[PDB]
Short mmCIF file of C-alpha atoms in Angstrom, two decimals:
data_model
loop_
_atom_site.label_atom_id
_atom_site.label_comp_id
_atom_site.label_asym_id
_atom_site.label_seq_id
_atom_site.Cartn_x
_atom_site.Cartn_y
_atom_site.Cartn_z
CA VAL A 6 7.69 -36.43 47.33
CA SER A 7 11.27 -35.03 47.71
CA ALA A 8 14.25 -34.04 45.45
CA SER A 9 13.21 -36.26 42.51
CA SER A 10 9.52 -35.22 42.33
CA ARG A 11 10.50 -31.57 42.40
CA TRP A 12 13.01 -32.26 39.68
CA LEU A 13 10.37 -33.86 37.45
CA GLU A 14 8.06 -31.02 38.46
CA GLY A 15 10.66 -28.40 37.52
CA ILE A 16 11.38 -30.20 34.21
CA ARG A 17 7.57 -30.03 33.58
CA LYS A 18 7.59 -26.39 34.58
CA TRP A 19 10.50 -25.81 32.25
CA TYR A 20 8.73 -27.43 29.26
CA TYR A 21 5.65 -25.45 30.05
CA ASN A 22 7.56 -22.17 29.90
CA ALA A 23 9.34 -23.24 26.74
CA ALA A 24 6.06 -24.37 25.14
CA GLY A 25 5.02 -20.73 25.26
CA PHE A 26 1.22 -20.83 25.15
CA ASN A 27 1.35 -18.96 28.45
CA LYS A 28 2.83 -16.01 26.56
CA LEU A 29 -0.42 -15.66 24.66
CA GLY A 30 -2.50 -15.92 27.85
CA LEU A 31 -3.63 -19.38 26.80
CA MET A 32 -4.23 -22.19 29.13
CA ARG A 33 -3.13 -25.77 28.28
CA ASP A 34 -6.62 -26.96 27.57
CA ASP A 35 -7.09 -24.06 25.03
CA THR A 36 -4.41 -25.61 22.91
CA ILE A 37 -5.90 -29.16 22.70
CA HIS A 38 -6.49 -30.41 19.13
CA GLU A 39 -10.16 -30.70 18.33
CA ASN A 40 -11.26 -34.26 17.57
CA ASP A 41 -14.79 -35.59 18.24
CA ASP A 42 -14.15 -36.44 21.94
CA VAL A 43 -12.85 -32.92 22.38
CA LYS A 44 -15.54 -31.25 20.28
CA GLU A 45 -18.08 -32.88 22.64
CA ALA A 46 -16.28 -31.85 25.78
CA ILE A 47 -16.22 -28.22 24.56
CA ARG A 48 -19.97 -28.59 23.98
CA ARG A 49 -20.56 -29.89 27.48
CA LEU A 50 -18.75 -26.92 29.14
CA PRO A 51 -20.79 -24.60 31.23
CA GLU A 52 -21.62 -21.10 30.00
CA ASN A 53 -18.86 -19.30 31.95
CA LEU A 54 -15.92 -21.53 31.04
CA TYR A 55 -17.10 -21.66 27.43
CA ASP A 56 -17.19 -17.91 27.24
CA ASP A 57 -13.74 -17.56 28.91
CA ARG A 58 -12.27 -20.15 26.57
CA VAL A 59 -13.47 -18.17 23.48
CA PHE A 60 -12.04 -14.95 24.80
CA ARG A 61 -8.69 -16.58 25.46
CA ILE A 62 -8.49 -18.16 21.99
CA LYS A 63 -9.48 -14.79 20.51
CA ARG A 64 -6.92 -12.97 22.56
CA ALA A 65 -4.24 -15.40 21.36
CA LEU A 66 -5.23 -15.48 17.62
CA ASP A 67 -5.12 -11.69 17.73
CA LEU A 68 -1.67 -11.71 19.32
CA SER A 69 -0.51 -14.44 17.00
CA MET A 70 -1.65 -12.29 14.10
CA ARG A 71 0.42 -9.28 14.88
CA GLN A 72 3.11 -11.61 16.22
CA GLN A 73 3.21 -9.96 19.52
CA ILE A 74 2.96 -11.50 22.96
CA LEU A 75 1.60 -10.55 26.38
CA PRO A 76 3.59 -8.56 29.02
CA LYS A 77 5.34 -11.09 31.31
CA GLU A 78 3.03 -10.49 34.28
CA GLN A 79 0.00 -11.54 32.24
CA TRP A 80 1.49 -14.83 31.11
CA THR A 81 -0.34 -17.69 32.56
CA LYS A 82 1.54 -19.14 35.36
CA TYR A 83 2.12 -22.85 35.41
CA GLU A 84 0.05 -24.59 38.06
CA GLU A 85 -2.35 -21.73 38.34
CA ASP A 86 -3.14 -23.31 34.98
CA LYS A 87 -6.60 -24.71 35.53
CA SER A 88 -7.27 -27.74 33.41
CA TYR A 89 -10.97 -26.94 32.95
CA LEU A 90 -11.54 -29.42 30.04
CA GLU A 91 -9.97 -32.57 31.50
CA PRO A 92 -12.93 -33.87 33.59
CA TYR A 93 -15.28 -33.40 30.63
CA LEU A 94 -12.93 -34.96 28.16
CA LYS A 95 -12.34 -37.85 30.49
CA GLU A 96 -16.02 -38.65 30.78
CA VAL A 97 -16.65 -38.32 27.04
CA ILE A 98 -13.88 -40.83 26.42
CA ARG A 99 -15.19 -43.09 29.12
CA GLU A 100 -18.61 -42.97 27.40
CA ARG A 101 -17.11 -43.76 24.03
CA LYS A 102 -15.09 -46.66 25.38
CA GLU A 103 -18.21 -48.20 26.90
CA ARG A 104 -19.95 -47.93 23.51
CA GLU A 105 -16.91 -49.61 22.07
CA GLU A 106 -17.03 -52.49 24.57
CA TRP A 107 -20.67 -53.10 23.77
CA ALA A 108 -19.89 -53.06 20.06
CA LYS A 109 -17.59 -56.10 20.54
CA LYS A 110 -19.97 -58.59 21.96
CA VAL B 1 0.70 24.38 -1.25
CA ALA B 2 1.13 21.06 0.73
CA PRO B 3 -2.05 20.20 2.86
CA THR B 4 -4.25 21.58 0.06
CA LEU B 5 -2.03 19.68 -2.48
CA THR B 6 -3.10 16.03 -1.98
CA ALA B 7 -6.49 17.55 -1.14
CA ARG B 8 -6.78 18.98 -4.72
CA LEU B 9 -5.65 15.71 -6.26
CA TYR B 10 -8.43 13.97 -4.36
CA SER B 11 -11.04 16.74 -5.10
CA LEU B 12 -10.35 17.11 -8.79
CA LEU B 13 -9.33 13.58 -9.74
CA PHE B 14 -9.60 10.77 -7.17
CA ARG B 15 -13.19 11.24 -5.96
CA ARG B 16 -14.81 9.76 -9.04
CA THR B 17 -13.51 6.39 -10.16
CA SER B 18 -13.90 7.93 -13.66
CA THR B 19 -11.17 10.48 -13.33
CA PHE B 20 -9.16 8.10 -11.02
CA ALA B 21 -8.85 5.68 -13.94
CA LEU B 22 -8.39 8.37 -16.59
CA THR B 23 -5.57 9.82 -14.49
CA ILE B 24 -3.68 6.59 -14.02
CA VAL B 25 -4.01 5.81 -17.73
CA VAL B 26 -2.84 9.32 -18.67
CA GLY B 27 -0.31 8.76 -15.88
CA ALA B 28 0.80 5.37 -17.32
CA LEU B 29 1.54 6.95 -20.73
CA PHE B 30 3.90 9.73 -19.61
CA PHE B 31 5.48 7.56 -16.90
CA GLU B 32 6.37 4.87 -19.46
CA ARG B 33 8.28 7.28 -21.52
CA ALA B 34 10.02 9.02 -18.56
CA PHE B 35 10.99 5.70 -16.95
CA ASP B 36 12.16 4.17 -20.21
CA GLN B 37 14.47 7.04 -21.34
CA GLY B 38 15.47 7.72 -17.72
CA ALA B 39 16.50 4.07 -17.18
CA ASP B 40 18.08 3.68 -20.67
CA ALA B 41 20.34 6.64 -19.81
CA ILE B 42 21.35 4.96 -16.53
CA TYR B 43 22.12 1.76 -18.50
CA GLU B 44 23.84 3.99 -21.07
CA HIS B 45 26.22 5.69 -18.53
CA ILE B 46 27.39 2.61 -16.65
CA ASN B 47 28.49 1.26 -20.00
CA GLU B 48 29.57 2.96 -23.33
CA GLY B 49 30.56 -0.27 -25.14
CA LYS B 50 27.57 -0.75 -27.55
CA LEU B 51 26.54 1.57 -30.46
CA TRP B 52 28.54 4.62 -29.29
CA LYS B 53 31.03 2.99 -31.70
CA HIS B 54 28.46 3.35 -34.60
CA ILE B 55 29.76 6.87 -35.55
CA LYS B 56 32.78 5.18 -37.13
CA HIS B 57 31.81 2.21 -39.43
CA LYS B 58 28.49 3.66 -40.74
CA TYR B 59 28.04 7.10 -42.43
CA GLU B 60 30.28 5.46 -45.13
CA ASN B 61 27.10 3.95 -46.68
CA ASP C 224 -22.07 36.40 34.26
CA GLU C 225 -18.49 37.80 33.75
CA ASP C 226 -15.57 35.38 34.03
CA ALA C 227 -16.13 31.55 34.01
CA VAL C 228 -18.48 31.33 30.95
CA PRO C 229 -16.85 29.09 28.28
CA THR C 230 -18.14 28.27 24.80
CA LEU C 231 -18.35 24.87 23.15
CA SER C 232 -15.32 23.32 21.58
CA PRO C 233 -15.78 21.44 18.28
CA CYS C 234 -15.93 17.66 18.44
CA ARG C 235 -13.76 15.64 16.12
CA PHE C 236 -15.74 12.99 14.22
CA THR C 237 -13.70 9.86 13.89
CA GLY C 238 -15.11 7.10 11.78
CA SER C 239 -14.57 3.70 13.09
CA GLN C 240 -16.37 0.73 14.50
CA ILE C 241 -17.53 -0.75 17.76
CA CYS C 242 -18.81 -4.30 17.68
CA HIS C 243 -20.37 -5.84 20.73
CA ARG C 244 -20.74 -9.48 19.81
CA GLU C 245 -23.44 -11.24 21.86
CA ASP C 246 -24.98 -14.33 20.31
CA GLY C 247 -27.39 -14.65 23.17
CA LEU C 248 -29.56 -11.78 21.91
CA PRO C 249 -31.90 -12.89 19.03
CA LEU C 250 -31.72 -9.94 16.62
CA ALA C 251 -28.77 -7.80 15.59
CA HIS C 252 -28.80 -4.06 15.93
CA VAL C 253 -26.59 -1.98 13.64
CA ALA C 254 -26.22 1.80 13.36
CA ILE C 255 -24.03 3.41 10.67
CA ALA C 256 -23.42 7.09 9.98
CA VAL C 257 -21.23 9.67 8.30
CA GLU C 258 -20.55 13.05 9.81
CA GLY C 259 -23.31 15.48 9.23
CA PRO C 260 -23.03 19.24 9.55
CA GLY C 261 -24.58 20.96 12.52
CA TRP C 262 -27.95 22.57 13.27
CA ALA C 263 -27.09 25.81 11.50
CA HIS C 264 -26.18 24.40 8.04
CA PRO C 265 -28.69 25.07 5.23
CA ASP C 266 -28.11 21.70 3.75
CA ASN C 267 -29.97 19.73 6.46
CA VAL C 268 -33.06 20.19 4.33
CA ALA C 269 -31.67 18.32 1.25
CA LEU C 270 -30.36 15.59 3.58
CA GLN C 271 -33.79 15.20 5.11
CA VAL C 272 -35.31 14.89 1.63
CA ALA C 273 -32.84 12.13 0.68
CA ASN C 274 -33.41 10.38 4.02
CA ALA C 275 -37.15 10.57 3.43
CA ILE C 276 -36.73 8.90 0.01
CA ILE C 277 -34.99 6.01 1.81
CA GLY C 278 -37.52 6.33 4.63
CA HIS C 279 -38.26 3.70 7.22
CA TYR C 280 -39.66 0.25 7.60
CA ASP C 281 -41.09 -1.97 10.17
CA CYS C 282 -42.61 -5.43 10.02
CA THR C 283 -46.07 -4.04 10.89
CA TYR C 284 -46.29 -1.73 7.88
CA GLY C 285 -49.01 -2.65 5.45
CA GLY C 286 -47.74 -2.49 1.91
CA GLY C 287 -44.67 -4.62 1.52
CA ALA C 288 -43.64 -5.12 -2.02
CA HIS C 289 -45.28 -1.92 -3.26
CA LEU C 290 -43.54 0.56 -0.99
CA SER C 291 -41.85 3.38 -2.97
CA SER C 292 -38.52 3.28 -1.19
CA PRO C 293 -36.49 0.53 -2.80
CA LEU C 294 -34.78 -0.33 0.54
CA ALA C 295 -38.12 -0.72 2.23
CA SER C 296 -39.53 -2.72 -0.65
CA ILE C 297 -36.56 -5.11 -1.02
CA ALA C 298 -36.46 -5.46 2.77
CA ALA C 299 -40.10 -6.43 2.96
CA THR C 300 -40.18 -8.96 0.11
CA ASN C 301 -36.94 -10.58 0.84
CA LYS C 302 -37.56 -10.22 4.63
CA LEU C 303 -34.16 -8.69 5.25
CA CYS C 304 -35.07 -6.98 8.50
CA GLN C 305 -37.53 -6.33 11.22
CA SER C 306 -37.15 -2.60 11.08
CA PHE C 307 -34.91 0.17 9.76
CA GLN C 308 -34.85 3.94 10.06
CA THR C 309 -32.82 6.67 8.51
CA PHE C 310 -31.76 9.56 10.74
CA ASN C 311 -30.08 12.93 10.72
CA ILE C 312 -28.99 13.82 14.21
CA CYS C 313 -27.84 17.44 14.77
CA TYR C 314 -25.38 18.96 17.24
CA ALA C 315 -23.48 22.31 17.31
CA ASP C 316 -21.22 21.98 14.28
CA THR C 317 -21.49 18.38 13.58
CA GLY C 318 -23.94 15.46 13.45
CA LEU C 319 -24.60 11.82 12.60
CA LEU C 320 -26.26 11.05 9.31
CA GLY C 321 -27.26 7.57 8.49
CA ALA C 322 -29.44 4.64 9.29
CA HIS C 323 -30.14 2.01 11.94
CA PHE C 324 -31.61 -1.44 11.49
CA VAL C 325 -32.67 -4.57 13.35
CA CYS C 326 -32.42 -8.02 11.80
CA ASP C 327 -31.75 -11.73 11.98
CA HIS C 328 -28.15 -12.86 12.16
CA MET C 329 -28.10 -14.02 8.50
CA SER C 330 -29.36 -10.79 7.08
CA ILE C 331 -26.90 -8.18 8.22
CA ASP C 332 -24.79 -8.43 5.09
CA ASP C 333 -27.72 -8.16 2.57
CA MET C 334 -29.18 -5.34 4.65
CA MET C 335 -25.92 -3.30 4.54
CA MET D 1 -41.98 -3.25 -26.56
CA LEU D 2 -38.93 -1.34 -25.18
CA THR D 3 -41.44 1.46 -24.52
CA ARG D 4 -41.06 0.50 -20.84
CA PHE D 5 -37.84 2.56 -20.66
CA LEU D 6 -39.28 5.68 -22.26
CA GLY D 7 -40.19 8.49 -19.88
CA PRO D 8 -38.97 11.48 -17.83
CA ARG D 9 -37.20 9.42 -15.12
CA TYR D 10 -35.27 7.34 -17.67
CA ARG D 11 -34.41 10.55 -19.46
CA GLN D 12 -33.13 11.93 -16.15
CA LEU D 13 -31.27 8.70 -15.58
CA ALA D 14 -29.48 8.88 -18.92
CA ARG D 15 -28.25 12.42 -18.25
CA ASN D 16 -26.96 11.65 -14.75
CA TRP D 17 -24.79 8.91 -16.29
CA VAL D 18 -23.44 10.80 -19.27
CA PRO D 19 -20.38 12.53 -17.76
CA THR D 20 -19.54 9.08 -16.41
CA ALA D 21 -20.13 7.19 -19.76
CA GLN D 22 -18.18 9.92 -21.52
CA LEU D 23 -15.23 9.73 -19.04
CA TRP D 24 -15.25 5.92 -19.29
CA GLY D 25 -14.81 6.33 -23.06
CA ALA D 26 -11.83 8.68 -22.56
CA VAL D 27 -10.33 6.00 -20.31
CA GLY D 28 -10.99 3.33 -22.96
CA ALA D 29 -9.49 5.49 -25.74
CA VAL D 30 -6.23 6.64 -24.09
CA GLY D 31 -6.04 3.07 -22.77
CA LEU D 32 -6.31 1.62 -26.26
CA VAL D 33 -3.95 4.29 -27.70
CA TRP D 34 -1.20 3.86 -25.04
CA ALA D 35 -1.41 0.03 -25.14
CA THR D 36 -0.94 -0.43 -28.93
CA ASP D 37 1.19 2.72 -29.29
CA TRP D 38 -1.21 4.25 -31.76
CA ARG D 39 1.10 6.03 -34.09
CA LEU D 40 -1.63 8.09 -35.78
CA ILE D 41 -3.18 9.30 -32.51
CA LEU D 42 0.00 9.57 -30.46
CA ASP D 43 2.18 11.68 -32.77
CA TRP D 44 0.00 14.71 -31.87
CA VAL D 45 0.79 14.61 -28.13
CA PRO D 46 3.52 17.19 -27.13
CA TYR D 47 5.80 14.91 -25.11
CA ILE D 48 5.81 11.14 -25.99
CA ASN D 49 7.43 11.89 -29.30
CA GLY D 50 9.68 8.85 -28.99
CA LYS D 51 9.19 8.12 -32.72
CA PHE D 52 11.14 11.29 -33.71
CA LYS D 53 9.66 12.18 -37.19
CA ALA E 194 26.52 -18.45 -26.41
CA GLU E 195 24.27 -15.73 -24.90
CA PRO E 196 23.33 -13.05 -27.53
CA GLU E 197 20.53 -11.72 -25.30
CA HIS E 198 23.13 -10.91 -22.59
CA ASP E 199 22.96 -7.12 -22.71
CA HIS E 200 19.28 -6.60 -23.32
CA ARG E 201 18.51 -8.89 -20.46
CA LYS E 202 20.58 -6.82 -18.06
CA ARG E 203 18.88 -3.70 -19.28
CA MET E 204 15.52 -5.34 -18.43
CA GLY E 205 17.02 -6.61 -15.22
CA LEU E 206 18.03 -3.06 -14.35
CA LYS E 207 14.48 -1.92 -15.03
CA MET E 208 13.13 -4.94 -13.04
CA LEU E 209 15.12 -3.81 -10.03
CA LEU E 210 14.00 -0.15 -10.35
CA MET E 211 10.38 -1.13 -10.89
CA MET E 212 10.44 -3.51 -7.98
CA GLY E 213 12.09 -0.91 -5.78
CA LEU E 214 9.19 1.36 -6.56
CA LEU E 215 6.43 -1.31 -6.58
CA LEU E 216 7.47 -3.35 -3.56
CA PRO E 217 7.15 -0.56 -0.91
CA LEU E 218 3.93 0.70 -2.55
CA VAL E 219 2.09 -2.66 -2.59
CA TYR E 220 3.36 -3.19 0.97
CA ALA E 221 1.87 0.18 2.04
CA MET E 222 -1.37 -0.69 0.26
CA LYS E 223 -1.58 -3.89 2.12
CA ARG E 224 -0.63 -2.40 5.48
CA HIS E 225 -3.28 0.31 5.05
CA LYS E 226 -5.94 -2.29 4.54
CA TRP E 227 -4.61 -4.47 7.42
CA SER E 228 -4.64 -1.33 9.72
CA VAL E 229 -8.20 -2.07 10.87
CA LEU E 230 -6.99 -5.32 12.26
CA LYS E 231 -3.56 -4.31 13.62
CA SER E 232 -4.88 -1.64 15.99
CA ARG E 233 -8.11 -3.37 16.87
CA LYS E 234 -8.73 -3.43 20.56
CA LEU E 235 -10.66 -6.21 22.37
CA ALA E 236 -12.51 -6.19 25.66
CA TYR E 237 -14.30 -9.07 27.44
CA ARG E 238 -17.34 -8.10 29.47
CA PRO E 239 -19.10 -11.12 31.01
CA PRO E 240 -22.24 -10.92 33.19
CA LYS E 241 -21.71 -10.41 37.03
#
């Protein structure tokens, strides 16, 4: 709760800012590497999130191309950083792991 | 004699790919000579050690 | 009448592109044009002749392969579109001269 | 059986492409001349007399 | 040891002058073609 948790939280906030995806309006989940589990989670996203995710990636690739970056006010703020993919990814993994358990017997 | 200048180049020579090519080939010929002599003379000035000495030894052949 | 009656100012033609990507719609619509001269210009007649040679097509036209216009003919046999139309739109001292077409996602390139 | 390409349109076609086929040949010529330094042909050009005599 | 010494530096001089002419030009050719992309503007317009 206290001093320590905030210190780990501020270290996490620090890494986040240093990581710099925020500068390209990206969200953490937009940066995930695409393996099968992930490819499936993307697939399972609802229409809105899927569309928003493509616009973000596009906005970033465009920025990344001309090596520019977004004005500071438009950077994504840490913990306003919605992890939209997580629940889907989690379930896809959970599904795979069950297949895997069955494959052992 | 400036706006109409690159305009004429385009009108008379760059429009067709025919002329465009003909002009760069005619343009490669003259340029080669002008760049060669022009650069030889720059290599010539910064030196004066090679065959400027020729006037002496030879002629006596 | 008297004061407060302005004329029309010329309109700069630019020459660019606007792409509204939307994979939800089933057929692509594309419209391309160069700057044409206005209403007044004598040369709208020759442009209309050339446009006519290119003509128009639609999937309900009888005569596919045998159509005179090569665009129309190649479009029908190879099924490169659902429709296409040339146009020559006129305004004061300018205009849009070109064509518009409607086709399947994998046929935009061949069509162009 | 090359009588397929004999008619008014083909005759109109040939003419429309002549200035172009002619200008392509001028390109090919000067291009050949300048690339091998064709002594015979070059010596007649005002400047580019970098072979003195 | 190096008989080609002079001639090489004459070519090297020419290599520097050619490059100084060619480099900016090819760069401008490439920037001109990349223009379309550099100034492209995007807009996102979702339903609702």
